[PDB]
Every structure is written in C-alpha cells, then in structure tokens.
Ligand binder design. Structure first.
Ligand SMILES: *[C@@H]1O[C@H](CO)[C@@H](O)[C@H](O)[C@H]1NC(C)=O
Lengths: 100, 98
C-alpha cells in the first residue's frame, strides 16, 4: 500500500503518496529488532477516520471516533479510540511481521 | 436473496465493545459474492486471538482465519444468557483440537 494511487487503511487513514509521485519506497524486514515475545505495542496505526487522507498529511489527532448514530462520549457505546496497537511477535508470518 | 445489506442495524442493536476491521470501518459502501457470516461465543480473554495469523490456544485449534481474512469482526457482551452460577452448555464450539 505504500505506493502511488493505492488504497487501504494506511493509504486512506495514516499515510498517502500523491498520484504524481517521484521517489523511492524502501522496505526492510525488521522482525529481529521490533518484535517482542509479549508483543511490541509501541507501534499504533489509525483504523478510524471521517475522511481519506491527502498526500503527505500527518493526522496525529487522538479524538474519539464514533461509528454509530447517537453522539457518545468516552469509549465503548459505538465510540472507539481512533488508533489501535499491533503486538508484533517473532512467531508471526511474513505478512504479519514488522517492516521498517 | 434480493438483500441489500445495511449495517446501521448492527450499530443500533447493542453497544459492541470490540469492532476490528482490515478493509474499512463503514463496511457498507463496499459488492461481494457472499458475506459467509459466522458466529460463536468466546471468553473475553482470547478476543485478540480471533485475528488473521494470530497464534493462541483459542482459534488456532477451533476456528482460525488463515491470512488476509476480511478483517471485520465484532464482539458484544453475552451476560444476558450466561447467568447460571454453575453454568450450562448450548452455544459452545468444539472445545479444542488434538
Ligand atoms: C486541516 O484543517 C482543516 C480545517 O479546515 C481540516 O478539515 C483538515 O482535516 C485538517 N487536516 C489535518 C491533517 O489536520
């Protein structure tokens, strides 16, 4: 998904490249350094947002997002935290392993 | 079945505590051939084990998602049925696998 014109939860909500993009995307497999046996929860990604991102914008808001119809406060009545942790583990497969 | 699927019923039904996804959160805009819905009841300690590629005692033997499962999964409180102090059984899946 780290490529011009792609869609998905990262291309849409965390990081987007412009369609007219010149540059290089270099991905390294980092399991040795980022994974923990209990899970590395220092890395968070945004799963909920109201709209798609524009090129090179950085949304660092932590305001609670609601997927439902009744405007709620706090967490759990259809109000969700916009970010979710991913516990990286040495035992995950190639597609679930961390990459830098 | 001349069905158009609206997921406002699901947000209205109950205050779901867990709602994970791999596609998108609205999950209504999206067509697909089948929704192949599955349901079951789990202890609220292994909820994070119902995920693509996630190892654990739950799901790895009972119900697993192999990889790139459409992520959308949801979980809400079952206390209205679970009230017996000694327990019962009706909704249980295969306990574990050899
Ligand atoms: C930038 O500010 C506008 C306010 O008009 C807002 O709609 C938009 O979401 C903001 N974007 C970011 C990345 O903060």
């Amino acid at each position: 998904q780290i490529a011009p014109g792609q869609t998905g939860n990262i291309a849409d909500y965390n990081y987007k490249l412009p369609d007219d993009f010149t540059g290089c995307v270099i991905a390294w497999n980092s399991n040795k350094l980022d994974s923990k046996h209990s899970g590395n929860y220092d890395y968070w990604y945004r799963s909920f947002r109201k709209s798609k991102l524009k090129p090179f914008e950085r949304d660092i808001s932590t305001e609670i997002y609601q997927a439902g119809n009744k405007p709620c406060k706090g967490k759990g009545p259809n109000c969700y935290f916009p970010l979710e942790s991913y516990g990286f583990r040495p035992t995950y497969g190639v597609g679930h392993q961390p990459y830098r | 079945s001349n069905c158009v699927a609206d997921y406002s019923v699901l947000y209205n039904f109950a205050p779901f505590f867990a709602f994970k996804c791999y596609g998108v959160s609205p999950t209504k805009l999206n067509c697909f051939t089948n929704v192949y819905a599955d349901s079951f009841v789990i202890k609220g300690n292994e909820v994070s084990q119902i995920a693509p590629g996630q190892t654990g005692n739950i799901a790895d033997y009972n119900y697993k998602l192999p990889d790139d499962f459409t992520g959308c999964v949801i979980a809400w409180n079952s206390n209205k049925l679970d009230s017996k102090h000694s327990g019962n059984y009706d909704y249980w899946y295969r306990s574990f696998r050899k």
